[PDB]
């Protein structure tokens, strides 16, 4: 037997071997594009959770074979209602590893290579190896980080972008019966940093409310988790709250009801306690399937130039009937991440606050360094202290350099 049985790729070939009226301008039919897909196109899937499993199936059945997966998580029982590449026996094993295992077994000659890592563990060298990158993660930080990484791979010769250095980034997200998908062509279209409004950071209750004006069950649970557990140390000095530890949640649940009684707040339940502690986002298989399908279809289009790619940002909502909405996000010219020209601040804790509390730069814990000397940092307890003196050594044109956990890049601002 040969690798590919009769008619195996019949459902894919038709879009590569036939000319068409809606084809991509640079598209030419060929009985050799499928080969590039099977033999050389390298695709990296960021995330083995939710979209990840769906994404590996999609690419595999679309003719991709050189696929890599990155994930730092272990299989959890709650993954099982939608992460179909894992079974109860797999609970505890690395998702990345199990995803490749299952995929390689189900799709005959696929070659999914796993990586029990977080995306921050790798550098340029690792990512340049890929033609396309599909991210199906859930944290905004990761999305921004990988967004910065690909931007960094860009090579401009005299202000003339080198197309070969562009690594398309397909990004997808889900939330219950809502989801989003988007195509980012680093240096050509809107990047993640260009549309921060589209990525509203998760809820983070205000201190005053949590510590002195609780009104909702969630505030109580939050208080116990964020203040009482650190103060008291229920399970021993240094013992960190383990959101998955049954005993820890029962503890949090009891102290929560305690605070709720004192303020006559109803609703503290074990389920709600788990929700808050783990900052759980409801999820189902169907919504992940829909969004991963849009994303994979776009990865396919970008690889074979079969059709022009999603302009750039699609939204899906399944609540009242269903619909998809697509629009073109605009590349912001004043972009901190993808613009080519350094930022222009016009003014120490004046910039650290500006770089944090702003909306254009929602940096989380920026480390500011003057031309050639660390001014402030935060990554070192002495740095955050010794250097802390925030307390009002620069001039006019000086080129400052910020650094956050949000990007692999050093945003140059003047």
């Amino acid at each position: 037997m040969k690798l590919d049985w009769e008619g195996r790729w019949n459902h894919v070939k038709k879009f590569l071997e036939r000319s068409g009226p809606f084809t991509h301008p640079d598209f030419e039919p060929s009985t050799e594009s499928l080969q590039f897909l099977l033999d050389t196109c390298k695709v990296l899937v960021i995330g083995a959770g939710g979209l990840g499993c769906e994404l590996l199936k999609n690419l595999a059945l679309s003719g991709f074979r050189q696929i890599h997966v990155i994930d730092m998580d272990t299989i959890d029982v709650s993954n099982l209602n939608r992460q179909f590449l894992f079974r109860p026996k797999d609970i505890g094993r690395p998702k990345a590893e199990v995803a490749a295992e299952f995929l390689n077994d189900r799709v005959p000659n696929c070659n999914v290579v796993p990586h029990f890592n977080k995306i921050q563990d790798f550098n340029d060298t690792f990512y340049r190896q890929f033609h396309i990158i599909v991210c199906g993660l859930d944290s905004i930080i990761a999305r921004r980080w990988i967004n910065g990484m690909l931007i960094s791979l860009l090579n401009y010769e005299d202000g003339v972008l080198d197309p070969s250095s562009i690594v398309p980034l397909i990004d997808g997200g889900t939330e219950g019966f809502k989801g989003n998908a988007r195509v980012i062509l680093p240096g050509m279209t809107a990047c993640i940093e260009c549309t921060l409004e589209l990525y509203p950071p998760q809820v983070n209750f205000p201190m005053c409310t949590i510590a002195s004006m609780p009104r909702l069950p969630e505030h109580c649970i939050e208080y116990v988790r964020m203040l009482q557990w650190p103060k008291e140390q229920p399970f021993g000095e240094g013992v960190p709250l383990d959101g998955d530890d049954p005993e820890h949640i029962q503890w949090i649940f009891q102290k929560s009801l305690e605070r709720a009684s004192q303020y006559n707040i109803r609703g503290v339940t074990y389920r709600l306690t788990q929700g808050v502690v783990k900052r759980i986002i409801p999820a189902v298989a169907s919504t992940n399937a829909v969004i991963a399908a849009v994303c994979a279809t776009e990865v396919f289009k970008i690889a074979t130039s079969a059709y022009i790619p999603l302009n750039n940002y699609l939204v899906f909502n399944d609540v009242d009937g269903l619909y998809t909405y697509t629009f073109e996000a605009e590349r912001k010219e004043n972009c901190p991440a993808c613009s080519q020209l350094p930022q222009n601040i016009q003014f120490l804790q004046e910039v650290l606050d500006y770089l944090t509390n702003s909306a254009s730069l929602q940096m989380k814990s920026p480390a500011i360094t003057a031309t050639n000397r660390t001014l402030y940092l935060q990554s070192v307890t002495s740095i955050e202290e010794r250097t802390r003196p925030l307390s009002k050594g620069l001039v006019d044109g000086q080129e400052l350099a910020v650094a956050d956990v949000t990007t692999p890049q050093t945003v140059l601002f003047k």
Binding site: T40, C41, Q129, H131, L185, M188, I302, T304, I308
Partner: peptide
């Protein structure tokens, strides 16, 4: 999109 994009169907350097 001002300029159209096409992926080279060759291996990277």
């Amino acid at each position: 999109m001002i300029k159209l994009f096409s992926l080279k169907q060759q291996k990277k350097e």
